[PDB]
Enzyme design. Structure first.
Site, PDB file in Angstrom:
ATOM      1  N   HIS A 100       5.390  -6.415   2.918  1.00 21.12           N
ATOM      2  CA  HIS A 100       6.049  -5.134   2.992  1.00 21.12           C
ATOM      3  C   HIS A 100       7.229  -5.430   3.948  1.00 21.12           C
ATOM      4  O   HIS A 100       7.014  -5.731   5.139  1.00 21.12           O
ATOM      5  CB  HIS A 100       5.044  -4.087   3.524  1.00 21.12           C
ATOM      6  N   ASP A 153      -2.441   1.249  -3.060  1.00 26.81           N
ATOM      7  CA  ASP A 153      -2.040   1.594  -1.690  1.00 26.81           C
ATOM      8  C   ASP A 153      -2.984   2.656  -1.125  1.00 26.81           C
ATOM      9  O   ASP A 153      -2.566   3.563  -0.457  1.00 26.81           O
ATOM     10  CB  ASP A 153      -0.573   2.068  -1.595  1.00 26.81           C
ATOM     11  N   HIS A 172      -6.296  -0.443   1.239  1.00 23.30           N
ATOM     12  CA  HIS A 172      -6.487  -0.252   2.680  1.00 23.30           C
ATOM     13  C   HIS A 172      -7.939   0.178   2.877  1.00 23.30           C
ATOM     14  O   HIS A 172      -8.314   1.274   2.432  1.00 23.30           O
ATOM     15  CB  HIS A 172      -5.561   0.838   3.232  1.00 23.30           C
ATOM     16  N   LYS A 178      -1.247 -10.467   5.139  1.00 20.57           N
ATOM     17  CA  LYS A 178      -0.262  -9.396   4.976  1.00 20.57           C
ATOM     18  C   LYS A 178       0.836  -9.490   6.025  1.00 20.57           C
ATOM     19  O   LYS A 178       0.546  -9.515   7.248  1.00 20.57           O
ATOM     20  CB  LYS A 178      -0.884  -8.022   5.112  1.00 20.57           C
ATOM     21  N   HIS A 198       3.597  -7.219   7.376  1.00 19.90           N
ATOM     22  CA  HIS A 198       3.996  -5.820   7.373  1.00 19.90           C
ATOM     23  C   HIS A 198       5.054  -5.518   8.424  1.00 19.90           C
ATOM     24  O   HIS A 198       4.969  -6.027   9.521  1.00 19.90           O
ATOM     25  CB  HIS A 198       2.791  -4.896   7.564  1.00 19.90           C
ATOM     26  N   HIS A 241       4.689  -2.865  -3.376  1.00 23.21           N
ATOM     27  CA  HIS A 241       5.507  -1.750  -3.810  1.00 23.21           C
ATOM     28  C   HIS A 241       6.970  -2.116  -3.833  1.00 23.21           C
ATOM     29  O   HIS A 241       7.770  -1.585  -3.051  1.00 23.21           O
ATOM     30  CB  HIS A 241       5.266  -0.535  -2.916  1.00 23.21           C
ATOM     31  N   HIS A 271       5.760   9.073   8.921  1.00 20.10           N
ATOM     32  CA  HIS A 271       6.620   8.533  10.001  1.00 20.10           C
ATOM     33  C   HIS A 271       6.857   9.483  11.166  1.00 20.10           C
ATOM     34  O   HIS A 271       7.604   9.152  12.066  1.00 20.10           O
ATOM     35  CB  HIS A 271       7.954   8.001   9.473  1.00 20.10           C
ATOM     36  N   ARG A 330      14.990   5.953   2.077  1.00 19.56           N
ATOM     37  CA  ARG A 330      13.717   5.317   1.671  1.00 19.56           C
ATOM     38  C   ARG A 330      13.244   5.789   0.311  1.00 19.56           C
ATOM     39  O   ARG A 330      12.812   4.995  -0.505  1.00 19.56           O
ATOM     40  CB  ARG A 330      12.594   5.573   2.710  1.00 19.56           C
ATOM     41  N   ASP A 369       5.447  -2.996  10.310  1.00 18.97           N
ATOM     42  CA  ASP A 369       4.861  -2.304  11.461  1.00 18.97           C
ATOM     43  C   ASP A 369       4.320  -3.294  12.460  1.00 18.97           C
ATOM     44  O   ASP A 369       4.157  -2.953  13.631  1.00 18.97           O
ATOM     45  CB  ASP A 369       3.749  -1.303  11.069  1.00 18.97           C
ATOM     46  N   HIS A 417      -3.794  -3.913  -3.667  1.00 17.79           N
ATOM     47  CA  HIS A 417      -3.180  -3.282  -2.496  1.00 17.79           C
ATOM     48  C   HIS A 417      -4.124  -2.239  -1.853  1.00 17.79           C
ATOM     49  O   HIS A 417      -3.823  -1.026  -1.808  1.00 17.79           O
ATOM     50  CB  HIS A 417      -1.802  -2.642  -2.829  1.00 17.79           C
TER      51      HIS A 417
HETATM   52 NI    NI Z   1       3.502  -1.168   2.418  1.00 18.09          NI
HETATM   53 NI    NI Z   2      -0.095  -0.373   2.063  1.00 20.45          NI
END
Ligand code: NI
Ligand code: NI
Ligand code: NI
Ligand code: NI
Ligand code: NI
Lengths: 833, 140, 140, 833
Positions: free
Chosen positions: A516, A630, A406, A487, A489, A542, A590, A606, A491, A404
């Site tokens: 995700h 992550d 980035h 991925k 996601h 996650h 956020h 969350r 978003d 995971h």
């Molecule tokens: Ni995520």
């Molecule tokens: Ni992530």
């Protein structure tokens, strides 16, 4: 200033001493790293003063910090402190052995020159009551059993000292030692592997000799006895002993026999068992504390034949014609042997030598020289052209695989390899909004660039595209470009339509889909996303959900047979600051407002204690198969390994045993960041475990530091990164010791040692050629038919329910509740910040 | 004569006495892939227009008799990335029945016309003496 | 050997598509023909298949390295394909070469000229023996 | 110590806190960077102490530094301080929001553990009375005008929370929301782009929905309504709503209408204008303070259609089938979009999305998804395969181009890109006497080597040869070798004969000639050098003359039509220390003696207040077209940009306005280090401005930091260098944040992203092939027909006279005099030293 590099580094070392000095004056008990900086710093200043000699500081250094000023583990961790400095007569090395040599130290003198007020003793906390300790079984071991033996009188008739190692062919000794050369034929000293008998001039000694093993062929020394041991070559050796004047007096009476496995036989040599462990590391039955956790690993199997251990050094075993073979076919010499390793792997905790050939693990077992030792197979030869990495007393594990990632900054990478990670999988293009939110490298162009960018770095890499699409068109493109996974996601939108379209694409290209989920339940609750999977393999990131997914019950996924679930590391395990930290981290990521009703509702929906507590347990249950970082998007690159062991340590202490040691738990957990990430992403034939035929991506650990900071990272058979002290110093161990890149990380080496992973489609087009990559490129595969049952030691499939108001998680009927730990191991003892 | 033989027809191998019978045909009679002026493989008709561009075949061998250990059959052959991508009924799913997603003749697809012809694998010679480079040209 | 130093056209070798049209249809074949001809002492340009009623794959062949597109009747040279192809040419600054619809299947020459819409286009064998609107392509 | 990288970095961070602590105890008011270091440092120590929780430090951090202890700008600059440290329970992130939360702070506690005496309040200066402030026009904006609309009752009949983003296709909602699905068809929420409506379970809400735009094609979600919005697909969507059990209750009575541009229409949604600016950055009419200068930039034009802004994130606009297009041809997806950017460029100050494709700027305008949004052209599609760089609230400008570079050391380069420079032009071969004096790479061999040396670095480069020659012979050679320009320097002799021979060569090869004239007037005064130009284009370096040229009147050249004149940066602008500094710098560079009559005469003839004052004005007049560094040979690589704005700021305050904002001055000045250097050196089609078809060499700025320290440097479409915090941290923003190289600067990437510029002759020979360069190579051109009138916004041509005794400069009859500023912006607020 004309500062040379070493001057720049010492300034840093000094700064660390001074910080340690400030903590000391506050009456803080110092940890290992602090004790070291402080003492090296003072040593350097005392040298600057010009008043003190090396011998002085050797003493003065033991009397700065005392038991009172340090933490309970420090006296065992700090074997010594080394530093070099410029005396009035040039650079000299000062070693302070056992610096905690007393109860009170000498505060004044520990601070002297810092101009910090000297604290009084009562400002320090009171002493509390050993990381990586070896618990030895009681007893002795008889060396070299079942072998012909003889005791011989030996005299040193020379005028200078003569010393003989344990594995030297005794007939081939200095011509000035006088003894019965004919009885010595085919013999060597019956003593612990790698030590020696010293003969001062004129000395008489009575020596226990034992037969050599294996093929019984003598090579080297003086060439007295060249050849296999037989009656015909004995006659020739004696001819040469006479002609060349090698000291010889017949001992017609010499006691002869064998090394029998019974009490009080005068030919046998025994080694105290505690002492065996200290010389060669632990053996079958011994147990090893993992770092400063409560975990113990018991040696399950040992390949060593007691008395023939492979140890390298002056007078030691790994020498020409002894432990180092001479005359086997050159092509089968091991490139490198790791000697006397404790291997911890999902597949077993054992003691073994590890041979490396062509960047690969060639063999695991008893290594050495078949001419002189029993039990050496033809794939474990230490030869002339074999390098030696000494594992005695250390643990080896596979390089960790973080799946995971980035790619926000290149420095994540250095932080990863330095903690013990050798493979990274995720997505990104640097510090953009997209990459900061999601593991996605979206454009084909950027695939090209990330592969080329990371081409010299000594890690294996995979890059994942953006899977959020309700049409396959652009997915085909990003995979053909070299994405080895996609991925999904939220978003970018994780909707049932996107989920479906993306899995249909995974079925065609044999790549993994990492997800995700839709936290907002915008287009469905978790059941709708599960339905959209349609029984197809998918990796859920996650899985607990703090880091993303259906509020509040994404954790349900740990019970779907086609789901491969991972956790990210910051919720691991549930500790006293967990919830507070994560709420605010969520508020920050956020862009939410502490003072707005619904912002605070989203965030309480969350970040949930009830589900994080359940994550500790499902993790112990083997219901969550992988741990990942992550990196910089809610998790921590350098803490994949430590958070794994910290989760294990907490569960050992909270729950029942899992199957007089912690083997079953140790293996379950090591699997979470080694083998299981490799299975999930489809490259488990190449990496993820210590097994023959896989890349020799290998991390050496001190047991006292296991799970916090490793010694050395081997990448493809060559040292890529490692602890390293003063480059100007007379040895590698003097301060400042820090993790630095090694020869495996320079020039073209990183590429020669590693793999870039792409889809098969991209490889079918030879994107390695198109993109000009020097790193080896391989395709991922065998990912569309995985189920939870393919996760090694983590195949549990509980029925999970989650109460929509209380957030309480039930697994197989049992309400999951877990306590909030106030501390964790692998932290305060190890880190300077 | 137009499209080469179909299920049940037989073909003499060269001037030997050997006869291959077509065991299976993937064609749906009337939609054969034939390329030419006025022919089937044209924009929007047999040549597809609008499918995702990545899945166009690089080349299609149309109406081939395949003779191979595994079967003597009639099929279109799809090539992609230097590999055999598919074997079956090829064309345009917008206008023809029976065209799977791995058999699309697209804008970027080259045509090799196999109607009337036999396709076999490349031979493999495994007792070669590299005595001269010309053996090599004589082999291919 | 006759005095030519630059060649512009399309193809991939002796296939049915290349024997009929100046088209190198797949991106893969562009790569290959440029690699293939890399040691030959002539300048070369390769053209993709322009016959399309959608721009999707045309984008791709030009990105692959085509320096021009060929519209050929054998792949369909209909007013829709002609428009879509020339709209692409306006984006990428490449030349469109055309062999018109001999069959007047879709339109007579007037209709193809209308489909140009005043945009630059290279008409191949403008007289028409070699192809195009019967009997009057020459009007171009 | 076994220091991991993160430990090494934190030691640095700590050192910076301690320095800040020492300044505080001196009663200095701290700047932004100091406030940050200090607070992160203490947070780390408090964590070391082990006494305090994350929640505690969150509070404690707001009460260390108060308004009294900081500079006037700090409370606006310091939004928060983040750092991670090792608690007793492992690593935890602490965010301190709004750390200046009070008037007095708590000094004792800000210093606690430093052992520095705690100052009293009265030791601090008295408070004085906002860098990058947005001045919003008063008012509201109606979102989404001229669209069909409907208000619908919506119920959450699920048992878990459901939240819907502004651009989600409303018919595609979670099946548990119940409303009139048929009326929702083709609709989405009429709310600010990128926020959301939250429905707790059981909640009833009354929602304003508005029609989607553009083609009105629905994709994704649940695939309920797949297809274009029409009567026929509505019938199909309803069939699917029924079959699949999506909550539906007819609302026969629902109010229907449109978003009309008039007061109190119940379908319309308005956004407060201050709030628009805060969410999406400023729009037409808003003004933006450049850094802490007095300059204001007014948005001249906005491409945004209010309500469809491209914002990326959870629930936000850039999601599959919404703002992210699904089904357009894959090849036209943008590689990267920069969203909501304020562009400042010589050609306009505007608000726009920027699309990047193939390393190039593909388009500038309104971007997004033509299926759902009006006004999206086919060259601005955000698609599946598009990365996102969030520009909302930031300024983008072209990468700066420094065209007076001395390649003295490679570190100049890092300092350059880190300040916002992406192209360097000059000469050198490292720290030799020749390079230290002149921008010359003299030997062909050295051309070869500098090109190869800089081949992996993510900047565009040009190298210039030694133009001092009275015969063309060797000039031909150095250009054929790859020099893209020639330097005429007095230290190699700048004589009329050399000047002529070198320009005749420039005429043949189409390269620029840069000149530093004969200060000594050895062979002529300035008129003789001007005569020798013979009306041919020439670039005059540091035209004012402090950095070299005819004493005292080289500045006359700013009035020759064929001269393209630049200044170097250290005389910019005239401030209180300018003269003193420059005299001594001259004494040092010329090895002169303070005590010898003629040494001091030479130096007073070179460094002249009267001419530096004139330089401020001619610079404001557009009489001097470029600003450059003179890196380490009288000027400063990292200060090309800041010195430009500091010159603008001083002139705004001293002189008349130039054409209710500072647009005309802003554009004149930005041109001096972007477009005009590129024109002068002949590569302006490739770089130097934010325009379609040029390299996406692009720098992102915070308005509060504009002109001092940028956020991010994009090189050829990929992030090359950027602010980056703790690599081990859970996010990228925790301390220490510093400028670090990014993926664009690793391995082969630097080369793939950049251009080496050579002469056409060198390219005709394929020196790119000969030299083995991986960086793209292009030829310079269109340089021999330039006049002062080709310099964008800097084409002024005054008649200049200079009094030979007073040094007074007259331009167009007007005596030029300017005051000596005591301070400058973009300095004390920003730098730690
Ligand atoms: Ni995520
Ligand atoms: Ni992530
Ligand atoms: Ni033709
Ligand atoms: Ni100069
Ligand atoms: Ni200079």
């Amino acid at each position: 200033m004309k500062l040379s590099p070493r001057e720049i580094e010492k300034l840093g070392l000094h700064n660390a001493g001074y910080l340690a000095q400030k903590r000391l004056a506050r009456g803080l008990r110092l940890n290992y790293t602090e004790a070291v900086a402080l003492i090296a710093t003072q040593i350097m200043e005392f040298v600057r003063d010009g008043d003190k000699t090396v011998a002085q500081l050797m003493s003065i250094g033991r009397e700065l910090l005392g038991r009172r000023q340090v933490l309970p583990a420090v006296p065992k961790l700090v074997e010594s402190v080394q530093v070099e400095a410029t005396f009035p007569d040039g650079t000299e090395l000062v070693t302070i052995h056992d610096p905690i040599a007393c109860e009170n130290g000498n505060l004044e003198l520990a601070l002297l020159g810092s101009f910090l007020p000297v604290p009084s003793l009562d400002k320090f906390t009171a002493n509390d009551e050993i990381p990586g300790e070896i618990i030895v079984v009681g007893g002795n071991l008889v060396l070299n059993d079942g072998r012909k033996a003889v005791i011989l009188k030996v005299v040193n008739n020379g005028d200078r000292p003569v010393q003989v190692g344990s594995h030297y062919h005794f007939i081939e000794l200095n011509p000035y030692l006088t003894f019965d050369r004919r009885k010595a034929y085919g013999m060597r000293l019956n003593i612990a592997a790698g030590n020696a008998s010293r003969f001062e001039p004129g000395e008489c000694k009575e020596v226990l000799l034992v037969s050599i093993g294996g093929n019984k062929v003598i090579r080297g020394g003086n060439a007295i006895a060249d050849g296999p041991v037989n009656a015909s070559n004995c006659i020739a050796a004696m001819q040469a002993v006479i002609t060349r004047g090698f000291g010889h007096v017949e001992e017609a009476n010499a006691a002869e026999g064998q090394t029998g496995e019974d009490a009080s036989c005068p030919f046998t040599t025994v080694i105290s068992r505690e002492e065996y462990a200290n010389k060669y590391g632990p053996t079958t039955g011994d147990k090893i504390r993992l770092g400063d956790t409560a975990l113990f690993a018991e040696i399950e199997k040992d390949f060593a034949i007691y008395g023939d251990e492979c140890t390298f050094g002056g007078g030691k075993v790994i020498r020409d014609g002894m432990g180092q073979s001479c005359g086997h076919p050159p092509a089968l010499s091991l490139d490198t042997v790791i000697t006397n390793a404790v291997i911890i792997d999902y597949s077993g905790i054992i003691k073994a030598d590890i041979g490396i050939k062509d960047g690969l693990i060639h063999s695991i077992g008893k290594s050495g020289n078949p001419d002189v030792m029993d039990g050496v197979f033809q794939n474990m030869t230490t030869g002339v052209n074999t390098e030696v990495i000494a594992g005695e007393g250390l643990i080896v594990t596979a390089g960790a695989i973080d799946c995971h990632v980035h790619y926000i900054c290149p420095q994540l990478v250095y932080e990863a390899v330095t903690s013990g990670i050798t493979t990274l999988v995720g997505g990104g293009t640097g510090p953009t909004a997209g990459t900061r939110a999601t593991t996605c490298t979206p454009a084909p162009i950027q695939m090209k660039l990330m592969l080329q960018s990371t081409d010299d770095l000594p890690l294996n890499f995979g890059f994942t595209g953006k899977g959020n699409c309700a049409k396959p068109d652009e997915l085909h493109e990003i995979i053909k470009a070299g994405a080895m996974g996609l991925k999904l996601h939220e978003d970018w939108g994780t909707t049932p339509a996107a989920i479906d379209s993306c899995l249909t694409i995974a079925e065609q290209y044999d790549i993994q889909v990492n997800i995700h989920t839709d936290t907002l339940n915008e287009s469905g609750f978790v059941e709708h996303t599960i339905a959209a999977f349609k029984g197809r393999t998918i990796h859920t990131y996650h899985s607990e959900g703090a880091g993303g997914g259906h509020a509040p019950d994404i954790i349900k996924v740990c019970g779907e047979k086609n789901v491969l679930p991972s956790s990210t590391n910051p919720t691991r395990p549930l500790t006293s600051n967990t919830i507070d930290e994560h709420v605010d981290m969520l508020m920050v990521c956020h862009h939410l407002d502490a003072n707005i009703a619904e912002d605070v509702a989203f965030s309480a929906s969350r970040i949930r204690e009830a589900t994080i507590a359940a994550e500790d347990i499902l993790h112990d249950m083997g219901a969550i198969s992988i741990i990942s970082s992550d990196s910089q998007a809610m998790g921590r690159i350098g803490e994949v390994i430590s958070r794994t062991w910290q989760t294990a340590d907490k569960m050992k202490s909270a729950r029942g045993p899992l199957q007089a040691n912690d083997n079953f738990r140790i293996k379950r957990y090591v699997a979470k960041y080694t083998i299981n990430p490799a299975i999930a992403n489809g490259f488990s034939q190449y990496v993820g475990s210590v097994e023959v035929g896989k890349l020799a991506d290998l991390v050496m650990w001190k047991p006292s530091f296991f799970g916090a900071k490793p010694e050395m990272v081997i990448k493809g058979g060559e040292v890529a990164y490692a602890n390293m002290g003063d480059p100007n110093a007379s040895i590698p161990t003097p301060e400042p010791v820090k993790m630095r890149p090694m020869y495996g990380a320079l020039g073209k080496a990183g590429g020669a040692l590693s793999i870039a992973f792409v889809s098969k489609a991209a490889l079918d087009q030879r994107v390695k050629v198109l993109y000009g990559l020097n790193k080896r490129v391989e395709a991922v595969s065998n990912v569309r038919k995985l189920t939870k049952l393919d996760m090694k030691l983590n195949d549990a499939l509980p029925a999970i329910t989650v109460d929509p108001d209380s957030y309480t998680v039930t697994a197989d009927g049992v309400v999951l509740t877990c306590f909030v730990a106030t501390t964790v191991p692998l932290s305060r003892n190890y880190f300077i910040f | 004569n137009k499209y080469g033989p179909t299920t049940g027809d037989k073909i003499r191998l060269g001037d030997t006495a050997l006869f291959a019978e077509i065991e299976k045909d993937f064609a749906i009679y009337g939609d054969e892939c034939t390329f030419g002026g006025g022919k089937v493989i044209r924009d929007g008709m047999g040549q597809s227009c609008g499918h995702p561009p990545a899945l166009s075949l690089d080349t299609v061998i149309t109406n081939a008799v395949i003779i191979d250990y595994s079967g003597i059959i009639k099929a279109d052959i799809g090539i992609k990335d230097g590999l055999i991508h598919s074997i079956g009924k090829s064309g345009n799913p917008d206008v023809m029945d029976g065209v799977f997603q791995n058999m699309t003749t697209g804008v970027n697809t080259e045509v090799i016309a196999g109607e009337g012809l036999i396709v076999t694998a490349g031979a493999i010679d495994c007792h070669v003496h590299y005595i001269c480079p010309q053996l090599v040209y004589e082999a291919v | 050997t006759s005095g030519i130093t630059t060649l512009v056209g399309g193809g991939t070798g002796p296939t049915a598509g290349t024997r009929a049209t100046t088209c190198t249809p797949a991106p893969i074949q562009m790569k290959l023909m440029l690699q293939s001809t890399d040691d030959l002492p002539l300048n070369f340009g390769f053209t993709g298949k322009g016959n399309c009623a959608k721009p999707d794959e045309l984008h791709e062949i030009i990105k692959a390295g085509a320096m021009g597109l060929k519209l050929h009747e054998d792949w369909g040279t209909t007013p829709a394909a002609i428009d879509s192809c020339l709209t692409i040419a306006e984006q990428y600054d490449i030349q469109v070469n055309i062999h018109t619809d001999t069959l007047n299947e879709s339109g007579f020459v007037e209709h193809t000229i209308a489909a140009f819409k005043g945009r630059t286009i290279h008409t191949y064998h403008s007289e028409g023996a070699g192809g195009g609107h019967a009997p009057d392509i020459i009007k171009v």
